[PDB]
Write a protein that binds this ligand. Structure first.
Ligand SMILES: Nc1ccc(-c2n[nH]nc2-c2ccc(C(=O)O)cc2)cc1
Lengths: 8, 270
């Protein structure tokens, strides 16, 4: 499963 | 002068944060540049100088408590502000830490979550609402086992009335923001702490889409103790008034017998 950052 | 008081190194990490060393005492720093054209909320210092709200909030939380990043100094330039921020060494942010380690053992997640709670309490006691609590905004001082909350660029002065604006991270934002574009500060913070705690003990955040955020179902993809599941589900109550206070979080059975920061470093980080 792909884990990613999330910009503000 | 900024170029004369600091030795500037390479980029760290669309943001602009550079590694640095304070020429006075060779102290490691992070040098953060913020364009005036991109500043959302402005504030005023005691001197009345118009500064980014981020600087206002950083000054209000700066003190001896090392759970929040310390603003060491700041400068104004024609088109930007420059922020001199603390830089622990060695350091890793909690996002990369969870990526490399996967789901954290509950003993380690307990120590980290407890330290985040103390840091957020410190913010609120100083009149500051962070509004962007997430693993990306938490630095781990690996040698001391201490966590540091960073990036107040989405924060606000803490108030008891409703907020109708938000610029933090959507997948950590509460369902009342998703549905009604309104929230109250503390209960929204508690929701983001629920997302963060799930993130720690499962290895990634639970929700990626708006419909998951408002749906009110928490599936656990990893073995997680009943006590920890209860705390997480409590923090993620759909109704904000149903969420725990910070006191209720820290009194929860899962939170008892936390490790000290130094114990955390020696057992889990060394
Ligand atoms: N991925 C990543 C690696 C290293 C840092 C870092 N290292 N030392 N200070 C910082 C730092 C502190 C505060 C802020 C802020 O308040 O915005 C930004 C950066 C931050 C992130």
């Amino acid at each position: 499963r792909k884990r990613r950052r999330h910009p503000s | 002068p900024l170029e004369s008081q600091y030795q500037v190194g390479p980029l760290l990490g669309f943001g602009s944060v550079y590694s640095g060393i304070r020429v006075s005492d060779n102290l490691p720093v992070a040098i953060k540049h913020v364009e005036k054209d991109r500043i959302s909320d402005w504030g005023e210092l005691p001197n009345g100088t118009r500064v980014p709200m981020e600087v206002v909030l950083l000054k209000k939380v700066s003190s001896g408590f090392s759970g929040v990043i310390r603003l060491l100094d700041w400068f104004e330039r024609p088109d930007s502000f420059v922020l001199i921020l603390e830089r622990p060494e060695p350091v890793q942010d909690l996002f990369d830490f969870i990526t490399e380690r996967g789901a954290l053992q509950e003993e380690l997640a307990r120590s980290f979550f407890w330290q985040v709670l103390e840091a957020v309490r410190h913010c609120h006691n100083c009149g500051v609402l962070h509004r962007d609590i997430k693993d990306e905004n938490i630095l781990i001082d690996l040698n001391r086992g201490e966590l540091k909350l960073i990036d107040f660029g989405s924060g606000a002065l803490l108030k008891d009335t409703v907020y109708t604006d938000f610029d933090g991270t959507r997948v950590y934002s509460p369902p009342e923001w998703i549905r009604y574009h309104r929230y109250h500060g503390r209960s929204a913070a508690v929701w983001s702490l629920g997302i963060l705690l799930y993130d720690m003990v499962c290895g990634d955040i639970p929700f990626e889409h708006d419909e998951e955020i408002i749906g009110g179902q928490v599936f656990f993809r990893q073995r997680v103790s009943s006590e920890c599941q209860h705390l997480i589900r409590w923090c993620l109550a759909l109704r904000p008034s149903d969420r725990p206070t910070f006191e209720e979080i820290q009194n929860h059975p899962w939170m008892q017998d936390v490790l000290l920061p130094q114990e955390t470093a020696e057992i889990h980080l060394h």
